[PDB]
């Protein structure tokens, strides 16, 4: 209950308290015959009569209502952090329960000490939190949480995001050429700023569209990171079953020794540790059946030859069935070039919007939204198959290229040129990385020659 009235970052304090309780149970069991700690824990978690427990339910509640809409990812450190000027304050979490000190860590001093110890985990989310989450949710909770996140992304993409996409597609220019190098960098910046004026001045853009995109990106990032943590716990679980399953390591054969005979000697050294044959020889039919089933469960883990992220990406691709995303067939029969009827051009416009320097009294996009915004945008682009067209056709990349060529620097409508190209380069690096990862995880129309009259 104390977990249920706190944010997601308190999962570490939760498992610490659970470990204290387990140690208490172990100590008291030396003299008293209590219920197994698993039985007590399941009874307290409402996980006996029901599939999922309170901890996983609150984990999903926290995700939905506080984690996706309030945290900012950092790619290099691999950590989330709360946003500045938070978008959601409607959580209304349960009121904290209180009790005597011996139901918490054990005393006033111990309570203070442990609170100080775990206060260090409060202002970020990172690998340790994911370890605890996986370890407490198991396959059941992980699967249910991923399914619910898929439902959330489906609702968001086919809901508010779709409406804003339609509106902005209406507002975008009908035709937009990429000017030639001879036009200049200042001229090209002025041209882009004039053409995208309606998108630049759209008030609700940065406060609604970017918020929902950040939510989607945070969801997919959570799926990726939680899968990585699950694999990392599975490998450790397997490293401990090896002795009882006969998985010897490779031994060092010195001069004049046979690897096969050496390994046979090692195997016969450890043969007493091998569990299944020992029970088969000395055990009972029911014991043998249970041992076989348990060994089969133990040795087969997702870390060895299975993956989950690609299935999530395919399911998400199945949600973009509206015709607005892909647009109508190209006139020339190959691909749109100067038209703006595809999502990747809308994203290029949004990139132009958030690559402009801002005033000191305002907040930058990475201060408010982090890296989830770009993960969402690049995911949408990649799933539709528009990544290469996006790379070739893009206002910001074109401006960066031309400015690099001619090396100019001025101010256009209160937008310094050199600073803008530097920001564009940084975001280009980030976008290339994201696109490359997404392509990695996902692993012909011929034409007729002319006919003589």
């Amino acid at each position: 209950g104390r977990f249920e009235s706190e944010d997601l970052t308190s999962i570490v304090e939760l498992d610490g308290l659970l470990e204290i309780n387990r140690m208490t149970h172990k100590l008291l069991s030396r003299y008293l015959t209590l219920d197994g700690f698993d039985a007590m824990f399941r009874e307290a978690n409402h996980n006996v009569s029901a599939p999922y427990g309170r901890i996983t339910l609150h984990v999903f509640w926290e995700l939905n209502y506080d984690f996706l809409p309030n945290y900012c990812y950092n790619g290099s450190t691999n950590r989330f952090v709360r946003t500045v000027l938070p978008f959601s304050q409607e959580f209304q979490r349960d009121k904290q329960p209180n009790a005597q000190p011996q139901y918490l860590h054990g005393s006033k001093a111990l309570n203070l000490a442990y609170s100080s110890i775990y206060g260090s985990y409060r202002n970020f989310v990172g690998p340790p939190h994911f370890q605890v989450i996986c370890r407490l949710l198991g396959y059941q909770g992980i699967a249910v949480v991923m399914e619910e996140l898929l439902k959330v992304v489906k609702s968001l993409l086919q809901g508010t995001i779709l409406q804003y996409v339609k509106t902005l597609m209406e507002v975008m220019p009908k035709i937009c050429r990429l000017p030639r190098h001879e036009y200049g960098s200042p001229g090209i910046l002025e041209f882009f700023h004039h053409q995208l004026k309606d998108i630049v001045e759209y008030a609700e853009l940065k406060t609604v569209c970017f918020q929902n995109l950040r939510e989607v990106g945070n969801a997919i990032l959570f799926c990726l990171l939680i899968e990585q943590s699950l694999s990392l716990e599975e490998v450790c679980d397997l490293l401990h079953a090896a002795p009882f399953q006969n998985i010897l390591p490779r031994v060092h054969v010195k001069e004049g020794e046979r690897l096969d005979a050496k390994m046979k000697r090692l195997e016969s050294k450890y043969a007493p540790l091998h569990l299944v044959p020992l029970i088969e020889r000395l055990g009972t039919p029911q014991q043998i059946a249970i041992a076989r089933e348990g060994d089969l469960l133990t040795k087969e883990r997702l870390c060895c030859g299975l993956s989950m992220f690609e299935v999530i990406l395919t399911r998400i691709r199945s949600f973009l069935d509206d015709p607005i995303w892909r647009g109508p067939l190209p006139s020339n029969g190959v691909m749109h070039v100067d038209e703006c009827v595809e999502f990747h051009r809308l994203w290029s416009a949004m990139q132009f919007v958030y690559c402009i320097p801002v005033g000191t009294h305002e907040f930058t996009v990475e201060q408010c939204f982090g890296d989830g915004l770009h993960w969402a945008g690049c995911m949408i682009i990649v799933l539709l198959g528009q990544q290469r067209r996006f790379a070739v056709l893009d206002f910001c990349y074109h401006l960066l290229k031309v400015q690099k060529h001619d090396g100019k620097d001025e101010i256009i409508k209160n937008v310094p040129l050199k600073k803008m190209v530097e920001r564009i380069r940084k975001f280009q690096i980030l976008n290339d990385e994201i696109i490359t990862i997404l392509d990695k995880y996902l692993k012909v129309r011929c034409f007729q020659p002319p006919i003589h009259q």
Partner: peptide
Amino acid sequence: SVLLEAIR
């Protein structure tokens, strides 16, 4: 989602 209704 509907599990949100259930938890509510």
